[PDB]
DNA sequence: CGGCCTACG
DNA sequence: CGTA
DNA sequence: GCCG
Protein backbone atom coordinates (compact mmCIF):
# COMPACT_ATOMS: atom_id res chain seq x y z
CA UNK A 1 0.00 0.00 0.00
CA UNK A 2 3.04 2.18 0.66
CA UNK A 3 4.80 2.50 -2.73
CA UNK A 4 8.51 1.75 -2.70
CA UNK A 5 9.78 4.93 -4.44
CA UNK A 6 9.41 8.31 -2.77
CA UNK A 7 8.14 9.87 -6.01
CA UNK A 8 5.09 7.56 -5.94
CA UNK A 9 3.57 9.00 -2.77
CA UNK A 10 2.83 12.40 -1.25
CA UNK A 11 5.19 13.56 1.49
CA UNK A 12 3.98 16.71 3.29
CA UNK A 13 6.30 19.07 5.13
CA UNK A 14 4.60 18.44 8.47
CA UNK A 15 4.29 14.76 9.33
CA UNK A 16 3.65 12.45 12.23
CA UNK A 17 6.87 10.51 12.95
CA UNK A 18 9.59 13.11 13.46
CA UNK A 19 11.24 11.31 16.36
CA UNK A 20 11.65 8.09 14.40
CA UNK A 21 12.70 9.78 11.14
CA UNK A 22 15.27 12.01 12.88
CA UNK A 23 16.92 8.93 14.44
CA UNK A 24 17.11 7.09 11.13
CA UNK A 25 18.51 10.25 9.48
CA UNK A 26 21.33 10.31 12.06
CA UNK A 27 22.27 6.79 11.00
CA UNK A 28 22.00 7.82 7.34
CA UNK A 29 24.31 10.78 7.90
CA UNK A 30 26.80 8.64 9.80
CA UNK A 31 26.76 6.05 7.01
CA UNK A 32 27.70 8.82 4.59
CA UNK A 33 30.53 9.89 6.88
CA UNK A 34 31.87 6.30 6.69
CA UNK A 35 31.62 6.29 2.91
CA UNK A 36 28.57 4.01 2.48
CA UNK A 37 26.19 5.71 0.14
CA UNK A 38 24.07 2.56 -0.01
CA UNK A 39 23.39 2.43 3.71
CA UNK A 40 22.79 6.20 3.66
CA UNK A 41 20.18 5.73 0.98
CA UNK A 42 18.38 2.91 2.79
CA UNK A 43 18.17 4.82 6.05
CA UNK A 44 17.01 7.97 4.22
CA UNK A 45 14.38 5.96 2.34
CA UNK A 46 13.15 4.35 5.55
CA UNK A 47 12.90 7.74 7.27
CA UNK A 48 11.01 9.08 4.24
CA UNK A 49 8.51 6.21 4.35
CA UNK A 50 7.68 7.25 7.92
CA UNK A 51 7.10 10.85 6.79
CA UNK A 52 4.49 9.58 4.32
CA UNK A 53 2.42 7.66 6.88
CA UNK A 54 -0.96 9.16 7.85
CA UNK A 55 -0.49 8.62 11.60
CA UNK A 56 2.14 8.14 14.31
CA UNK A 57 3.77 4.75 14.52
CA UNK A 58 3.07 3.45 18.02
CA UNK A 59 3.74 -0.29 17.67
CA UNK A 60 6.33 -2.49 15.91
CA UNK A 61 3.47 -4.16 14.10
CA UNK A 62 2.77 -1.02 12.07
CA UNK A 63 6.06 -1.43 10.16
CA UNK A 64 5.04 -4.80 8.74
CA UNK A 65 5.22 -4.75 4.98
CA UNK A 66 6.63 -1.24 4.69
CA UNK A 67 9.35 -0.85 2.05
CA UNK A 68 12.94 -0.20 3.13
CA UNK A 69 12.30 -1.56 6.67
CA UNK A 70 14.42 -4.59 7.38
CA UNK A 71 16.10 -5.93 10.46
CA UNK A 72 18.27 -2.86 11.19
CA UNK A 73 15.78 -0.04 10.67
CA UNK A 74 13.08 -2.04 12.43
CA UNK A 75 15.30 -2.58 15.51
CA UNK A 76 15.95 1.18 15.70
CA UNK A 77 12.23 1.92 15.67
CA UNK A 78 11.65 -0.95 18.18
CA UNK A 79 14.08 0.56 20.65
CA UNK A 80 12.70 4.08 20.28
CA UNK A 81 9.14 2.85 20.84
CA UNK A 82 10.05 0.75 23.88
CA UNK A 83 12.62 3.01 25.55
CA UNK A 84 12.43 6.42 23.89
CA UNK A 85 16.08 6.04 22.90
CA UNK A 86 18.17 3.89 20.55
CA UNK A 87 21.61 3.05 21.90
CA UNK A 88 23.22 2.97 18.45
CA UNK A 89 21.86 6.41 17.59
CA UNK A 90 23.05 7.86 20.89
CA UNK A 91 26.53 6.36 20.48
CA UNK A 92 26.81 7.97 17.04
CA UNK A 93 25.50 11.32 18.29
CA UNK A 94 28.08 11.57 21.07
CA UNK A 95 31.03 10.33 19.03
CA UNK A 96 33.90 12.69 18.31
CA UNK A 97 33.95 11.41 14.75
CA UNK A 98 30.30 12.17 14.06
CA UNK A 99 30.38 15.57 15.74
CA UNK A 100 33.52 16.68 13.91
CA UNK A 101 32.45 15.34 10.51
CA UNK A 102 29.14 17.17 10.94
CA UNK A 103 30.95 20.38 11.92
CA UNK A 104 33.27 20.22 8.92
CA UNK A 105 30.81 19.02 6.27
CA UNK A 106 28.48 21.87 7.25
CA UNK A 107 31.06 24.30 5.85
CA UNK A 108 30.32 25.53 2.35
CA UNK A 109 33.00 23.98 0.15
CA UNK A 110 33.71 20.98 2.42
CA UNK A 111 32.21 17.54 1.81
CA UNK A 112 32.71 14.11 3.37
CA UNK A 113 35.98 13.31 1.60
CA UNK A 114 37.59 16.62 2.61
CA UNK A 115 36.26 16.45 6.18
CA UNK A 116 37.50 12.89 6.56
CA UNK A 117 40.99 13.83 5.43
CA UNK A 118 41.12 16.70 7.90
CA UNK A 119 39.79 14.45 10.66
CA UNK A 120 42.49 11.86 9.93
CA UNK A 121 45.11 14.66 10.08
CA UNK A 122 44.01 15.50 13.63
CA UNK A 123 41.92 18.58 12.98
CA UNK A 124 38.82 19.03 15.13
CA UNK A 125 37.57 22.64 15.29
CA UNK A 126 36.89 25.53 12.95
CA UNK A 127 39.76 27.38 14.65
CA UNK A 128 42.03 24.48 13.67
CA UNK A 129 41.10 25.07 10.01
CA UNK A 130 41.54 28.84 10.20
CA UNK A 131 45.07 28.27 11.54
CA UNK A 132 45.99 26.22 8.42
CA UNK A 133 44.71 28.37 5.55
CA UNK A 134 47.06 26.65 3.10
CA UNK A 135 44.77 23.63 3.26
CA UNK A 136 41.74 25.65 2.07
CA UNK A 137 40.41 26.32 -1.39
CA UNK A 138 39.08 29.78 -2.09
CA UNK A 139 35.55 28.37 -1.85
CA UNK A 140 36.32 26.90 1.57
CA UNK A 141 37.89 30.16 2.74
CA UNK A 142 34.64 31.95 1.90
CA UNK A 143 32.56 29.28 3.59
CA UNK A 144 34.69 29.56 6.71
CA UNK A 145 34.74 33.37 6.67
CA UNK A 146 30.96 33.56 6.59
CA UNK A 147 30.25 30.42 8.59
CA UNK A 148 28.37 32.13 11.47
CA UNK A 149 25.93 33.88 9.16
CA UNK A 150 25.54 30.80 6.95
CA UNK A 151 24.56 28.80 10.04
CA UNK A 152 21.61 31.18 10.66
CA UNK A 153 18.43 29.91 8.95
CA UNK A 154 17.30 31.95 5.97
CA UNK A 155 13.67 33.11 6.46
CA UNK A 156 10.89 34.25 4.04
CA UNK A 157 11.54 37.98 4.56
CA UNK A 158 15.09 37.32 3.36
CA UNK A 159 13.76 35.56 0.31
CA UNK A 160 11.42 38.31 -0.79
CA UNK A 161 14.15 40.95 -0.51
CA UNK A 162 16.62 38.74 -2.32
CA UNK A 163 14.19 38.00 -5.09
CA UNK A 164 13.61 41.71 -5.65
CA UNK A 165 17.33 42.42 -6.05
CA UNK A 166 17.83 39.37 -8.27
CA UNK A 167 14.87 40.40 -10.46
CA UNK A 168 16.31 43.91 -10.78
CA UNK A 169 19.69 42.62 -11.94
CA UNK A 170 18.09 40.06 -14.27
CA UNK A 171 15.84 42.71 -15.82
CA UNK A 172 18.80 45.01 -16.32
CA UNK A 173 20.74 42.16 -17.95
CA UNK A 174 18.03 40.94 -20.33
CA UNK A 175 14.57 42.47 -20.73
CA UNK A 176 11.80 39.92 -20.40
CA UNK A 177 13.87 37.45 -18.42
CA UNK A 178 12.15 35.90 -15.41
CA UNK A 179 13.10 34.69 -11.94
CA UNK A 180 11.39 31.74 -10.24
CA UNK A 181 11.94 30.76 -6.60
CA UNK A 182 12.74 27.04 -6.34
CA UNK A 183 14.19 24.81 -3.64
CA UNK A 184 12.62 24.20 -0.27
CA UNK A 185 10.82 27.53 -0.20
CA UNK A 186 8.81 26.46 -3.22
CA UNK A 187 7.92 23.25 -1.34
CA UNK A 188 6.52 25.44 1.47
CA UNK A 189 9.43 25.44 3.93
CA UNK A 190 9.62 28.49 6.15
CA UNK A 191 13.41 28.34 6.45
CA UNK A 192 16.38 27.08 4.46
CA UNK A 193 20.13 27.10 4.35
CA UNK A 194 20.15 28.89 1.00
CA UNK A 195 17.80 30.49 -1.52
CA UNK A 196 17.43 28.97 -4.98
CA UNK A 197 16.43 30.90 -8.12
CA UNK A 198 15.79 29.65 -11.67
CA UNK A 199 16.16 32.21 -14.48
CA UNK A 200 14.95 31.92 -18.07
CA UNK A 201 13.64 33.93 -21.02
CA UNK A 202 10.55 33.08 -23.08
CA UNK A 203 12.49 33.29 -26.39
CA UNK A 204 14.73 30.22 -26.72
CA UNK A 205 18.41 31.20 -26.90
CA UNK A 206 18.09 34.74 -25.62
CA UNK A 207 19.35 33.60 -22.20
CA UNK A 208 22.74 32.55 -23.56
CA UNK A 209 25.41 34.44 -21.63
CA UNK A 210 22.94 35.77 -19.10
CA UNK A 211 24.42 34.54 -15.83
CA UNK A 212 27.76 36.37 -16.15
CA UNK A 213 25.86 39.59 -16.89
CA UNK A 214 23.64 39.11 -13.83
CA UNK A 215 26.61 38.32 -11.60
CA UNK A 216 28.48 41.36 -12.82
CA UNK A 217 25.50 43.61 -12.11
CA UNK A 218 25.06 42.16 -8.62
CA UNK A 219 28.80 42.44 -7.95
CA UNK A 220 28.81 46.09 -9.03
CA UNK A 221 25.96 46.80 -6.59
CA UNK A 222 28.06 45.34 -3.75
CA UNK A 223 25.74 42.39 -3.27
CA UNK A 224 28.25 39.54 -3.86
CA UNK A 225 30.68 38.29 -1.22
CA UNK A 226 31.75 35.15 -3.10
CA UNK A 227 31.17 33.52 -6.44
CA UNK A 228 33.30 31.24 -8.57
CA UNK A 229 34.04 33.83 -11.29
CA UNK A 230 30.69 30.67 -19.79
CA UNK A 231 28.54 29.45 -16.92
CA UNK A 232 24.88 28.64 -16.12
CA UNK A 233 24.99 27.81 -12.38
CA UNK A 234 26.39 29.96 -9.61
CA UNK A 235 26.61 28.94 -5.95
CA UNK A 236 27.13 32.32 -4.34
CA UNK A 237 27.26 34.15 -1.03
CA UNK A 238 25.35 37.44 -1.06
CA UNK A 239 25.80 40.48 1.18
CA UNK A 240 22.12 40.88 2.07
CA UNK A 241 21.18 44.29 3.50
CA UNK A 242 19.56 44.23 6.95
CA UNK A 243 18.33 47.12 9.12
CA UNK A 244 21.48 49.10 9.81
CA UNK A 245 23.75 46.29 8.62
CA UNK A 246 24.00 43.14 6.49
CA UNK A 247 24.29 39.37 6.67
CA UNK A 248 25.80 36.78 4.39
CA UNK A 249 23.28 34.50 2.67
CA UNK A 250 23.91 31.55 0.36
CA UNK A 251 22.10 32.00 -2.96
CA UNK A 252 22.05 29.62 -5.93
CA UNK A 253 21.30 30.98 -9.39
CA UNK A 254 20.58 28.78 -12.39
CA UNK A 255 19.89 29.86 -15.97
CA UNK A 256 18.08 27.46 -18.30
CA UNK A 257 16.64 27.80 -21.79
CA UNK A 258 12.87 27.88 -21.74
CA UNK A 259 12.67 24.51 -23.50
CA UNK A 260 14.30 23.02 -20.38
CA UNK A 261 12.40 25.11 -17.83
CA UNK A 262 9.98 22.38 -16.62
CA UNK A 263 12.89 19.98 -16.07
CA UNK A 264 14.98 22.55 -14.26
CA UNK A 265 12.03 23.63 -12.14
CA UNK A 266 11.34 20.02 -11.20
CA UNK A 267 14.96 19.23 -10.41
CA UNK A 268 15.80 22.33 -8.39
CA UNK A 269 12.52 22.17 -6.42
CA UNK A 270 13.62 18.89 -4.79
CA UNK A 271 13.63 17.51 -2.26
CA UNK A 272 17.06 15.98 -2.73
CA UNK A 273 15.71 12.51 -1.99
CA UNK A 274 12.58 13.07 -4.05
CA UNK A 275 14.64 13.89 -7.14
CA UNK A 276 17.11 11.01 -6.74
CA UNK A 277 14.13 8.67 -6.35
CA UNK A 278 12.35 10.17 -9.37
CA UNK A 279 15.50 9.80 -11.49
CA UNK A 280 15.93 6.22 -10.27
CA UNK A 281 12.28 5.45 -11.03
CA UNK A 282 12.57 6.95 -14.51
CA UNK A 283 15.60 4.88 -15.45
CA UNK A 284 14.86 1.62 -13.65
CA UNK A 285 11.08 1.44 -14.13
CA UNK A 286 10.53 3.37 -17.35
CA UNK A 287 13.84 3.09 -19.22
CA UNK A 288 14.08 6.88 -19.58
CA UNK A 289 16.94 9.11 -18.40
CA UNK A 290 15.91 12.18 -16.37
CA UNK A 291 18.01 15.20 -15.45
CA UNK A 292 17.50 18.96 -15.01
CA UNK A 293 17.72 19.45 -18.80
CA UNK A 294 15.29 16.85 -20.12
CA UNK A 295 13.91 13.32 -20.22
CA UNK A 296 15.66 11.13 -22.79
CA UNK A 297 14.51 7.94 -24.48
CA UNK A 298 17.83 6.20 -25.24
CA UNK A 299 16.28 3.73 -27.70
CA UNK A 300 14.51 6.35 -29.87
CA UNK A 301 17.25 8.89 -29.05
CA UNK A 302 14.62 11.57 -28.50
CA UNK A 303 13.87 14.08 -25.75
CA UNK A 304 10.37 14.50 -24.36
CA UNK A 305 8.93 17.95 -24.99
CA UNK A 306 7.31 19.04 -21.75
CA UNK A 307 5.44 22.27 -21.11
CA UNK A 308 5.02 21.75 -17.37
CA UNK A 309 6.04 19.60 -14.46
CA UNK A 310 2.66 17.85 -14.83
CA UNK A 311 3.68 16.72 -18.31
CA UNK A 312 6.85 15.10 -16.93
CA UNK A 313 4.96 13.20 -14.22
CA UNK A 314 2.42 12.01 -16.81
CA UNK A 315 5.11 10.82 -19.22
CA UNK A 316 6.63 8.78 -16.38
CA UNK A 317 3.26 7.24 -15.49
CA UNK A 318 3.16 8.94 -12.08
CA UNK A 319 0.37 10.75 -10.32
CA UNK A 320 1.22 14.43 -10.17
CA UNK A 321 2.51 15.75 -6.85
CA UNK A 322 2.58 19.52 -6.20
CA UNK A 323 5.82 20.91 -4.68
CA UNK A 324 4.41 20.82 -1.12
CA UNK A 325 4.03 17.02 -1.42
CA UNK A 326 7.65 16.44 -2.59
CA UNK A 327 9.12 16.76 0.91
CA UNK A 328 10.64 13.28 0.85
C1' DC B 1 25.46 -10.71 -6.53
C1' DG B 2 25.64 -5.48 -7.74
C1' DG B 3 22.98 -0.93 -7.63
C1' DC B 4 22.19 2.94 -5.27
C1' DC B 5 20.75 10.54 -9.35
C1' DT B 6 22.72 13.88 -11.69
C1' DA B 7 25.99 16.94 -14.14
C1' DC B 8 27.90 21.72 -13.96
C1' DG B 9 32.04 24.76 -11.72
C1' DC C 1 36.69 17.34 -5.59
C1' DG C 2 32.88 20.93 -4.68
C1' DT C 3 27.77 22.20 -5.32
C1' DA C 4 25.21 18.26 -1.59
C1' DG D 1 20.81 -1.58 4.27
C1' DC D 2 17.79 -3.08 1.61
C1' DC D 3 16.16 -4.88 -2.82
C1' DG D 4 15.68 -6.52 -7.78
N1 LIG E 1 21.09 19.21 -1.47
C2 LIG E 1 20.92 18.55 -2.63
N3 LIG E 1 20.07 19.02 -3.53
C4 LIG E 1 20.01 18.25 -4.63
C5 LIG E 1 20.71 17.09 -4.89
N6 LIG E 1 20.36 16.59 -6.15
C7 LIG E 1 19.43 17.45 -6.69
O8 LIG E 1 18.88 17.36 -7.79
N9 LIG E 1 19.23 18.49 -5.74
C10 LIG E 1 18.27 19.59 -5.93
C11 LIG E 1 17.01 19.39 -5.07
C12 LIG E 1 17.06 20.54 -4.03
O13 LIG E 1 15.77 21.04 -3.57
C14 LIG E 1 17.73 21.64 -4.86
C15 LIG E 1 18.43 22.74 -4.07
O16 LIG E 1 19.31 22.15 -3.09
P17 LIG E 1 19.12 22.60 -1.55
O18 LIG E 1 20.16 21.86 -0.72
O19 LIG E 1 19.11 24.11 -1.50
O20 LIG E 1 17.70 22.05 -1.12
P21 LIG E 1 16.54 22.67 -0.19
O22 LIG E 1 16.22 24.04 -0.70
O23 LIG E 1 15.44 21.64 -0.17
O24 LIG E 1 17.31 22.76 1.18
P25 LIG E 1 17.35 23.97 2.28
O26 LIG E 1 17.78 25.20 1.59
O27 LIG E 1 15.97 24.08 2.82
O28 LIG E 1 18.37 23.43 3.28
O29 LIG E 1 18.76 20.86 -5.53
C30 LIG E 1 21.61 16.57 -3.93
O31 LIG E 1 22.29 15.52 -4.01
N32 LIG E 1 21.66 17.40 -2.79
CA1 LIG F 1 29.60 21.33 2.89
CA1 LIG G 1 17.68 25.87 -0.62
CA1 LIG H 1 20.66 25.34 -2.92
CL1 LIG I 1 27.10 1.00 1.53
NA1 LIG J 1 10.64 -5.62 5.82
Delimit the domains of chain A by residue range. Answer: 1-95, 96-152, 153-258, 259-327
The most distant pair of C-alpha atoms in chain A lies apart, rounded to whole Å, by 61
Q: Assess whether the C-beta atom of A327 lies below 6 angstroms from ligand 1.
A: no
Residues paired with residue A255 on neighbouring β-strands, in sequence order: A199
**A240 touches A191 (CB < 8 A):** no
Experimental technique behind these coordinates = X-ray
d(CA A198, C1' B8) / Å: 15
Contact between residue A140 and residue A107 where contact means Cβ atoms under 8 Å apart: yes
Q: How far is the CA of A197 from the centre of ligand 4 (A)?
A: 9
- Beta carbons of A302 and A269 less than 8 angstroms apart: no
Within a 10 A sphere around the Cβ of A66, how many other Cβ atoms? 20
Candidate of A41, A270, A274, A323 to mutate for ligand 1, largest count of ligand atoms within 8 Å of Cβ: A270
Q: How do strand A245-255 and strand A233-242 relate by DSSP bridges?
A: antiparallel
Phi, psi of A58 (to 5 degrees): -115, -20
Residue A170, class by beta-carbon neighbours within 10 Å (0-12 exposed, 13-18 middle, 19+ buried)? buried
Considering only CA atoms, which residue is closest to the C1' of nucleotide B5? A276
Dist CA A122 CA A119 (whole Å): 5
Handedness of CA A155, A179, A174, A262 (dihedral sign): positive
Q: Do the beta carbons of residue A251 and residue A163 sit within 8 Å? A: no
Q: In angstroms, rounded to a whole number, what is the distance separating the alpha carbons of residues A80 and A26?
A: 13
Number of H helices, E strands in chain A: 15, 10
**Does residue A124's CB lie within 6 angstroms of at least one atom of ligand 1?**
no
Alpha carbon distance A234, A228 (integer Å): 7
How far, CA to CA in Å, does A92 sit from each of A25, A26, A27, A69, A102? 11, 8, 8, 20, 11
Provide, in whole angstroms, the distance separating residue A275's CA from nucleotide C1's C1': 22
A:149-208 Cβ neighbours of strand D under 7 Å: none
> Packing angle between helix A112-120 and helix A96-105, nearest 10 degrees?
130
Which segments of chain A are extended strands (E)?
Answer: 154-155, 178-181, 191-192, 195-200, 224-226, 233-242, 245-255, 289-290, 295-297, 302-303
Contacts of A14 (CB under 8 A, 6+ apart): none
- Measured from the CB, is A291 under 7 Å from any atom of strand C? no
Nearest residue to D1, CA vs C1'?
Answer: A39
Using alpha carbons, list the distances in angstroms from residue A180 to A204, A249, A261. Answer: 17, 18, 10
The DSSP bridge partners found for residue A245 are A242
**Beta-bridge mates of residue A197:** A181, A253
Question: What separation in Å is there between the alpha carbon of A35 and the centre of ligand 4?
Answer: 23
Output the residue whose Cα is nearest ligand 1's atom 10.
A268
Cβ(A194) to ligand 1 under 6 A?
yes
Q: Say how many Å lie between the CA of residue A136 and the centre of ligand 2.
A: 13
- Asked if residue A160 has its Cβ within 6 Å of ligand 1, the reply is no
Amino acid sequence: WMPAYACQRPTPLTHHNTGLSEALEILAEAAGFEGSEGRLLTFCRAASVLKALPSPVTTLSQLQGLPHFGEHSSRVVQELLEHGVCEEVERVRRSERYQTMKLFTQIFGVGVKTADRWYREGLRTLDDLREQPQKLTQQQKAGLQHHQDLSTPVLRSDVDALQQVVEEAVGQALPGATVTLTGGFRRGKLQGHDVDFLITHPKEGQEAGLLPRVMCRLQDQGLILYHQHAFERSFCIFRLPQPGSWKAVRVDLVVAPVSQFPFALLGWTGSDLFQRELRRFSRKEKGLWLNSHGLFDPEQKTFFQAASEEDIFRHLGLEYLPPEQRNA
